[model samples]
Target chain A: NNILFGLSHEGSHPQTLHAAQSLELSSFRFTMQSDCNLVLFDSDVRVWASNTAGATGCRAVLQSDGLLVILTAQNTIRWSSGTKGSIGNYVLVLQPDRTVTIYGPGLWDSGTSNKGSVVVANNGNSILYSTNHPQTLHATQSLQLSPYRLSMETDCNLVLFDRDDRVWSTNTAGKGTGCRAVLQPNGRMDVLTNQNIAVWTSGNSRSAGRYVFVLQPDRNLAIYGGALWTT
Target chain B: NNILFGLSHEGSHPQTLHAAQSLELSSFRFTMQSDCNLVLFDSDVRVWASNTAGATGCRAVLQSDGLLVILTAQNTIRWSSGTKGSIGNYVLVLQPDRTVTIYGPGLWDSGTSNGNSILYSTQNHPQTLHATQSLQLSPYRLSMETDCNLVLFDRDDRVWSTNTAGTGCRAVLQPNGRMDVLTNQNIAVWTSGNSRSAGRYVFVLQPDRNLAIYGGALWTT
Candidate 1:
């Protein structure tokens, strides 16, 4: 019901805006100009553009890697948004406000604390603490799935279990010396070694978003609104 | 004998230095103090330290991922040498003139362009040829473009380019004395003339911003 043109993870790609088809906002149209630049036109007058001209076979792509790149058939990078290293699903929206913006995953604002038993510090560093003292979970250490255990194992692995069931893991067993799984605020679930080397990643956490790693009463551990590593 | 400490890719942690053992430049010694900080001590006076004291069971590691980190047994990251994303073999050396440096695969100051290949990670980060004011290169020199083409450009025209272009490709400066542009799958797409003369090579980002691959002379010229 919204008057906005949008593309999701699957539908995102180069040649998203062809020469003929266009996205319109009021009298303004978002189209690929004849010069190969993706531009916003208001009744034949230009407003904003990607500024990639004289390049043949030019196209605009919202890359899966979270980068908006303008390239040619020759694979020349003309213009880029430089949004690389951002993890997650992204959307390019031509909104009703006559603005084209790429939107990614967003974190919930304050006041949602009542729905949880634990409150993580909001200093952007994601420090989790319980209302009860002594038992704390920092960026490292896993919460237990009682009768089952979730721990950063001594073998340099991050694992989830039910005694002998062996349900899930970061799968970094013995890959490095000392490993810790840190749920980064940027939405990346990373297993870093003692050397601070990122050995494995969930690859789901990405873009600009806020997230929390929580162990539910149902014995599930997850990054709320994102992915879950569970038994 | 070199004053370099070697850490292999498979070496585990706990400690990289065992005291008494130090890299020395005359009276100057670089070793880990009992306080857990990696320090450069000169006759009982401290010059520099990694500043990671009170970190239990700490170790200084040159990881395979290209980071120099000071980590503890509890997996705490205390201090880091922020040099990541460089690929290939690495070594931490205490130079004769008294500067400790982390060395990796690089083109020599004066040589033909040969030895190691410049690599791009599987994550699509391309290696860049940057120019600076103090260096013998112009600001607009060359780049292994994001989409993966070896291109030399100025403000307007892309003066020269290797015909090789692909998404997620890598460029290798081969030891056999050639510049081969390879795809992400490690297939060769385009290459400069093969010099076949075995020696050191130099890939210089010239003052004019051109990427010149040299063996004995400039390959691009």
Candidate 2:
């Protein structure tokens, strides 16, 4: 639970997925280890690897051309998704199951999940939203950005809080048994039921396009790139 | 008026500037000739070239990794800008007087233009919108697969178009700064307007599927 379940890198302003960072879902963990290999594991059992663990300081970067490449500190490509050029803003996300999916304007999935079910959220870019997740967050599943955290509580209410005082939330406690907040590509943050019904929304919606929800350093939750919604 | 004017290509998409197609900015003409030579012409004379001739079907392509390269039809690289992976979205543009420029998120200009002025329009995208000079439209598909027509694309969607597709047909900038889409018979199918100056104008297709002409002192639909 200390490690995040989802991690993203943007092409517009790139940040590499450095060594030691990881994304986990349930008992499954996908890690980019310091040994320079990207390994996916289930608890203590190794499942898959990029087979590139010989060097230190090797990093994984989601390139602007939509290639997920592992680069050594010497600035050479060690491994790549072999996808590039035509697409932009590539992303990698761990799923509700064991699968790890890669998305750009298109989709490439690693079908390592137990049930083989693919859950694409927020306009097929499950990684673009606020700490992106599936439609319904299970109890204790939260979206965190540094000092800020937005957690879906066991009470079914979505809460935004930091290290200190609680910030703001949807306050939909007990309103629905499994209400989870989902951020839509149309710019709406909805607290919805499993049956695709919305009981609470951030009240922001529009024509279809890309949008991002950010937990700001000021303890405010604002949609990045524009003034969509803020708390 | 053979100087042509205002030509460019963007890196957001990989496109080949093939032989027989050229981009111009008033006195500047950047041509990838049928002889496989990539040359820049000012007025009626040559300014710079890759000096790579005698090979037919040589082409120049701007890759998403931001490397501008000349590749033969046989798929061998003949020349390269040598910039790859370090940048994305490399662009090649022609400018007034005589200079032609290349951009790979960083600026690299020929600096050989001699029109007593430099006009870089719309934040280094000289091909997007125009006001002062007309432009020779170099649609990305300079060869096949949607080849002759002047088309605008929002990913896979075709929004605006000239419907002027051809074989041996070329786009050009008139002496008065007008852009004319052509046919194989050397006739214009459509045109933008004439201009009073060069290098100050640009034409761009927006993400919202809007086509516009942007000049520091001018605007057009």
Candidate 3:
């Protein structure tokens, strides 16, 4: 009954038979889990996101679509899965520009930004967007050393023109009309344009058994070699 | 009656029983019995030899006098008590050279050298006899190259030589000392020596188990 021991003992006996036969009978159950889904029971309910992809431990309840729910001893709501739970709560959304959005608040409203209508550009990558189709994609070549100058900025957009004086993007994105340059779950960036046409892409598909994710704490993007959505 | 198996039935029973039941019958009475002794029943002729030093295998019988009598089926007398069974032939005399022979023959003189001086030696290890203690002994040195002769070296280093057949089990007696090592029907092998001398020795591979003879302190070494 010591708190510390109770805390350590909590997570270890979630589905153990000893908990079932206990006089007080305290236990917990898990449903088809998800990517980086961690359930720490025992003392206080804690959950850490796991990046294990292509794993069965990520597979949980088949009843709910992608809904994860947890209950604790004190009749408290422990944790609910945030990934794939709801549409607006998207942790990250690749927009028209070559950049991705990390929405801080609840779904629907992206906290900070120039808002909508921004041309997608890359630091040193193949990025091309169009008002033709509006599907986000990022393709990147090797990192280049040379810097860029003014790319002829227009509206709310910044354009870096190279020494060749070649133009790349503009401000105020046209309506979604192309599957544009975008970043994948595996940290690879690619660009695609041609107004409603996927002319070209980064072509870097994730290696088998690898799962990619965005870590909030470090803001660093990473991928796990062998993680999969079990279900 | 078959010659090989003996008469199918002799008198009434076989001359020699392949096995003895130990149950005495009227015809076969248990005449003598003793532990560590040889007993022979010849219908009415009974003989026994106690398991003793000289009287081994019951080789020959001793009579009333100090004489020995070696018997046979003939009973015509091969060797006998010199005094015509006067005194029990218990006393034995051995020469210094280990030539063993009963003093008297039953007058048969069947052999050429009748009583003139017939002797037998019991040894194949031609070497000087050494007796360190009254027990332990061995043939000091062996000359395998030349004649393969064995010379007994005593503690004093005195040399006593003898003849060997190169093969084991053959021994030669001293001709001048009336000692001869010969094969006998009884054991096919045996040894005899001067029983009177304090340092006499004999190596018999039979009855007493094969052991070297220890003569004396120096002779036995």
Candidate 4:
């Protein structure tokens, strides 16, 4: 149980601190931009100064992951922990137009403008490999590779050498840019130009995207990077 | 070989004009407003008047994929084939921005604008797919899977897409309101808050000015 008080200290502890024994909070933070006289514990609860004791315009707010608690004195509604029907600093909205919007602070960590490198490779039949390297190694792989060397793929080529060297390449390349092996609803592949102009495409891959894979593994791979065959 | 002519006729089996052939192209449509002149061809030819005798100020342009042509004519220039320094309606320039601008009165096409849908998915797991089109009937579809891609078909020859799983996803509108893929998905994509209501000079136009699409939202000034 946690408590945050905003009221004139009448006694050692806030007499209004009753339901706090039931409040189960692991951690919380508080913002006390007011002159309320009160005592708080665990930093998760609030108290309104006794108006009869001259408590008037004291404001404060307490918030937790699950609920928000606000305390205020007077009809002015001095404090509010409610969302105010507005998005918080760490909320994100998935837009209807297939776009996503991040809100508030701490939602994203701004990466360095410096460019990075990625390596991709392809097997003769279909499957491909890819991995990312820091800005240092111009090639796909250089030395001592582990996590940075992304060895994951469904269709796109992504190969990681034992020593952090990347071979071949795939649609996901570079930092500021990546390729979309355009997939129509039916699974066809459409390659567009930089301006979103369709340059070429696999006439019919499938509504779900062309399903190509390694037969033995039973692992179905979808090529979403581009067309299977180059024009 | 595919051979086409603009306004002259020559070359045939009887009096076979090996390479020199000219024919007038009819029913050519040119947009009345924004500069429209991009005549691309895979040939080594010239533009001339239909009639050689009365041919005046006839200009033509030919371009090798490597050749950067920019045409800007001042007045009526003389008409001539295989003639250098002839400022016909053909001037080609390789726009540093990679846009080829053509200037001529004969036949040309310019870049146009259109509304487009940009999908920037923020799903993390490979199983998580995000798309503008909601899944209705065929639920667990492996093909319809979203690769956490940001695709804007028809924007560029090969549009930009990113697998923005780590830092989220973001998209942007270019100077012309064309949607561009921005890596930072945490910032304000676009806001139209009339916090300051002045004369309301809110004119929003796609920079390329090719308003051809119909589904997306209209640009409000």
Query: What is the C-alpha local distance difference test score of each model?
Result: 0.46, 0.47, 0.25, 0.23
TM-score of each: 0.25, 0.31, 0.15, 0.17
Per-residue CA lDDT of candidate 4, range A98-132, in tens? 21112121111112111133212211122221211
lDDT of 3 at B170: 23
The fraction of reference interface contacts (C-alpha pairs within 8 A across chains A and B) present in each candidate is 0.00, 0.00, 0.00, 0.00
The true-structure Cα RMSD of candidate 1 reads 25.4
Distance from true location, Cα of A43 in model 4, Å: 53
Candidate 2, superposed: residue stretches over 4 Å from native: A1-14, A17-27, A33-36, A52-57, A84-91, A103-134, A137-147, A151-159, A163-180, A183-188, A192-231, B1-221
- For every candidate in turn, the CA RMSD to the true structure comes to 25.4, 20.0, 45.6, 28.0
Cα TM-score of candidate 3: 0.15
> Which of the two candidates, 1 or 4, achieves a greater TM-score against the reference?
1
Error of 3 at B26 (Å): 99
Sort all candidates by lDDT, best to worst: 2, 1, 3, 4
- Candidate 1 error regions (>4 Å): A1-231, B1-136, B216-221
For residues B2-115, what per-residue lDDT tens digits would candidate 1 score against the true structure?
Answer: 223225432212225543345555666777555568777767898777867777766565544345666777767677776554454344544333455553433222121211
Tens-digit lDDT string for candidate 1 (A185-230): 5655666777888887756655444344433222344343321111
Residue A157 error, candidate 3, Å: 9.1
Provide i-RMS per model in Å. 13.3, 20.7, 52.2, 20.7
Instruction: Looking at model 2 chain A, report the run of 10 residues with the lowest lDDT sum.
Output: A5-14
Q: Write the residue-wise lDDT of candidate 3 on B1-221 in tens digits.
A: 11011121212122221112121322322211322122333355643332332222223333333344443333332434344322211222222332222222111110110001112222212222211201123323222212223333444352444443332122332221212232111011323342333222222111111222222111110
Candidate 3 C-alpha lDDT tens digits along A1-231: 000000111011111111111111022222123332433222244322332333221111111122232321111223434433222111222222222222211211111122122221222222212221122332222222133233112122223333355233333243233323343444333333445343323344444322222211111122222221221
In angstroms, the error of model 3 at A89 is: 25
